[PDB]
Design an enzyme around this catalytic site. Structure first.
Site, short mmCIF file in Angstrom:
data_model
loop_
_atom_site.label_atom_id
_atom_site.label_comp_id
_atom_site.label_asym_id
_atom_site.label_seq_id
_atom_site.Cartn_x
_atom_site.Cartn_y
_atom_site.Cartn_z
N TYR A 1 -3.71 -0.30 8.86
CA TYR A 1 -3.13 -1.55 9.35
C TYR A 1 -2.41 -1.33 10.68
CZ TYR A 1 -3.84 -2.70 4.38
OH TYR A 1 -4.36 -2.86 3.12
N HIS B 1 -5.10 3.61 3.66
CA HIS B 1 -5.07 2.15 3.68
C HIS B 1 -3.91 1.62 4.52
CE1 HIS B 1 -7.44 1.96 -0.39
NE2 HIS B 1 -8.18 2.39 0.62
N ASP C 1 0.81 -1.22 0.00
CA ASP C 1 0.00 0.00 0.00
C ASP C 1 0.85 1.28 0.00
OD1 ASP C 1 -2.89 0.15 -0.29
OD2 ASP C 1 -3.05 -1.20 1.42
N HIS D 1 -10.64 1.76 -7.74
CA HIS D 1 -9.27 1.97 -8.21
C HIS D 1 -8.96 1.14 -9.45
CE1 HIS D 1 -7.50 3.61 -4.15
NE2 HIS D 1 -8.55 4.29 -4.57
N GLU E 1 -3.57 -4.70 -6.80
CA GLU E 1 -4.63 -4.42 -5.84
C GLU E 1 -6.00 -5.04 -6.16
OE1 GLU E 1 -3.80 -0.77 -3.10
OE2 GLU E 1 -3.89 -0.01 -5.16
MN LIG Z 1 -5.48 1.31 -4.93
MN LIG Z 2 -4.73 0.55 -1.40
#
Ligand SMILES: [Mn+2]
Ligand SMILES: [Mn+2]
Ligand SMILES: Cc1cc2nc3c(=O)[nH]c(=O)nc-3n(C[C@H](O)[C@H](O)[C@H](O)COP(=O)(O)O)c2cc1C
Ligand SMILES: Cc1cc2nc3c(=O)[nH]c(=O)nc-3n(C[C@H](O)[C@H](O)[C@H](O)COP(=O)(O)O)c2cc1C
Ligand SMILES: [Mn+2]
Ligand SMILES: [Mn+2]
Lengths: 282, 128, 282, 128
Positions: free
Chosen positions: C99, C95, C61, C189, C152
């Site tokens: 985490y 994103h 990410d 995305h 992704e």
């Molecule tokens: Mn993305």
């Molecule tokens: Mn992402």
């Protein structure tokens, strides 16, 4: 490229600014802009043209900050957490630019908007300004980019930001003013943060190089200042407000310098703002 | 005497270096706590952003909620940025309204030359 | 030039800009604390796997934030394309940040740091990271979009399998909620970057499309083989290895469809346990 | 007969080219309106994102608010993406709930080989 750890922070400012900028999230759709339509209708032709020419100008510079400005600072980040904050800054510059289009869409006639766009394209002081800023962004010195960025939005932008703040104190276009205050709230943190990192970057270069950059910044400031006087004179030519706009420019120039760690240069006389403008700001 | 806090950006620090008046700094390290044995005006930066109470820095609270230091507090001066609208100098009137001490001055970033002249004249006239 | 949102060239830019911006979220808006009693019922093997999965996803990410989306910006067709890519870039930071929010709430620092070190040592993870980064630095704009869509809309789901699995067992349900927000972003995305890949296919010659089709399927299979190895090392002490691989094949077909290609993997290779599909879509 | 809408991405368009069955497309241009003269099954992609009612595309609503086309509607199939959680194929049950017609099938993007398979067998057995 390493896996980012937000629980292993090197510089506390990265988390503080990240948290502030993200929770300050807004969209132009959040502001009821259509409520300014009646107030828009009461403006003179001169005031209407000025407003459109101000925002067409600001769209160029925010687009520049979106596409070239904030992306160019990213390779020179000291921490990985700094990279993530600059990613936010970049996106919000697009929101800034997008929200100027929301104003034209709600209030103005398409024919006049395009005329204002074509006016900004031909305007020499504006184009000269944009070419100077991006010249430093395409340059090889990371510190000059950080200077250029702070000067652009913590100082130069306020030749245009004066106008809605003036309208605000008169009770006209209050929602547009609310919109602009959200942008200004973004830019204060943008200047503070980029200015902060400028000073952090200077802490790993020699003292002689520091003095060379101090001479550069003050020369660049005066260069852009002289060009912005010309820009103000062409924009506010039809009004008697130019001197008051120029006062507001010197007031923010001092703040731009203070973001970088330098003393304010402009004395009280030049930086004396009409109290109604400051009141609309706060 | 003046008591102040400043962050790693050191905006308030540079205001006091340019102020000239004797001052003691609230430590940046949260574990290190300082004690003051004289009456003072507190100079503090705002870190609110909005209106979620957290305008006063964490190191200032730990300084203030100590009964010894709180008693000797006489006034408060806030720094910040006008661009924060209503929240400009929010840390000032939060300490003022709570402790009962007056809110004296309100300046931006490193402070202008006008601000330094206004604070010098203000401090002397306050003890009077 | 100055961006104009009232002069839209491709109508799809505005639709995607509105979807992604109004989908804005932060990990702080997800009550992760309610998953602590569920976390304490998980076995040592399960906890170790959970941490290893998210540290791996943190790297990937971050890569999307720093190099990924920003490497697509100079290759944009429209000015509005760049503004949307600013958002994608920023949301990759969100994103990656989320985490860390999971580790903070549930896990222990000694166990988390061990997981980070495990991800540094892991060969398939680094190989995957190197290969994708290799295409972003390349001179071909078309291969950049392929690598981004594959990463992704396909590769991530070896990790995304785990939260969805726990969700179907009624464990860590709030953690899965957070993941579903990341998954929702990535569907858009992949759709958008895949759609822009197809618009870019219009300019290259008929014979040039056949070479890219070969490259895409070559890259897919090279990464697929590497992801089988990555899956086996992750799920080594669990009987779930073969179920994750089916979930990879199912998502690989969706990655291809985003780029406008036929699904490659047959039904019997891509057949996922209905409980995993139910957790994704109730 | 089948009636469908597809955006500039053309996912549902490529599904119908791979399906084989003769179908008529709802124009991408909003000004042009097309009319159908026989009973049909509608295939529509979802564009809701959340639950703000805007799941059904504008060109479809304009097609369906016409009493002539609406009366000939017999069933609906929705396309989309499972990654949208509860909103996967939202255009399906919204049309199904309002018009009273049954929601027949549910698939992703271009459709898998199993999807085309189930739509081929499904449509014929529906007419019978
Ligand atoms: Mn993305
Ligand atoms: Mn992402
Ligand atoms: C996250 C953040 C929040 C801020 N909030 C406010 C505020 O609510 N009101 C205000 O007047 N200034 C606010 N500021 C501006 C600071 O008060 C200003 O930069 C100050 O000069 C910092 O001083 P220091 O460097 O000594 O810490 C904020 C700055 C940051 C970075
Ligand atoms: C802005 C946007 C919103 C979407 N919303 C949904 C949705 O709510 N539910 C769903 O299942 N799919 C949703 N999708 C995915 C589309 O339904 C899917 O890509 C479909 O294949 C589009 O078909 P088309 O290319 O013929 O228009 C959305 C896609 C976009 C771009
Ligand atoms: Mn901006
Ligand atoms: Mn900015």
């Amino acid at each position: 490229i390493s896996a980012i750890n937000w629980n292993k922070i090197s510089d506390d400012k990265d988390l503080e600014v990240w948290n502030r900028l993200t929770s300050n999230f807004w969209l132009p759709e959040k502001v009821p802009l259509s409520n300014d339509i009646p107030a828009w209708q009461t403006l003179t032709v001169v005031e209407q043209q000025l407003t459109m020419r101000v925002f067409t100008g600001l769209t160029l510079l925010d687009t520049l900050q979106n596409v070239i400005g904030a992306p160019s600072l990213m390779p020179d980040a000291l921490t990985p957490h700094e990279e993530a904050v600059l990613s936010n800054i970049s996106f919000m510059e697009a929101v800034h630019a997008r929200s100027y289009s929301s104003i034209f869409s709600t209030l103005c006639q398409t024919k006049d908007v395009d005329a204002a766009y074509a006016w900004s394209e031909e305007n020499a002081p504006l184009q000269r300004k944009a070419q100077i800023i991006q010249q430093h962004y395409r340059g090889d010195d990371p510190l000059k980019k950080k200077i250029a960025s702070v000067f652009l939005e913590s100082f130069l932008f306020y030749s245009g930001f004066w106008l809605p703040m003036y309208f605000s104190s008169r009770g006209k276009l209050t929602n547009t003013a609310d919109l602009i205050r959200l942008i200004i709230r973004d830019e204060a943190v943008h200047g503070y943060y980029i200015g902060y990192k400028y000073q952090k970057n200077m802490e790993k270069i020699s003292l002689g190089q520091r003095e060379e950059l101090k001479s550069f910044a003050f020369d660049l400031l005066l260069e852009l200042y002289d060009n912005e006087l010309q820009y103000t004179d062409e924009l506010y030519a039809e009004t008697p407000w130019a001197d008051d706009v120029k006062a507001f420019l010197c007031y923010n120039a001092n703040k731009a310098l203070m973001n970088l760690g330098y003393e304010p240069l402009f004395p009280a006389e030049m930086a004396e703002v009409n109290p109604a403008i400051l009141a609309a700001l706060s | 005497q003046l008591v102040y806090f400043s962050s790693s950006s050191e905006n308030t620090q540079r205001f006091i270096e340019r102020l000239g008046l004797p001052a003691v700094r609230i430590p940046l390290n949260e574990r290190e706590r300082i004690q003051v044995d004289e009456p003072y005006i507190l100079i503090v930066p705002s870190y609110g952003g909005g209106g979620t109470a957290g305008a006063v820095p964490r190191q200032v609270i730990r300084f203030l909620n100590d009964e010894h230091n709180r008693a000797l507090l006489r006034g408060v001066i806030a720094s910040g940025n006008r661009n924060f609208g209503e929240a400009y100098g929010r840390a000032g009137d939060v300490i003022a309204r709570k402790c009962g001490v007056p809110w004296l001055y309100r300046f931006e970033l490193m402070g202008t030359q006008s601000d330094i002249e206004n604070v010098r004249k203000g401090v002397t006239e306050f003890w009077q």
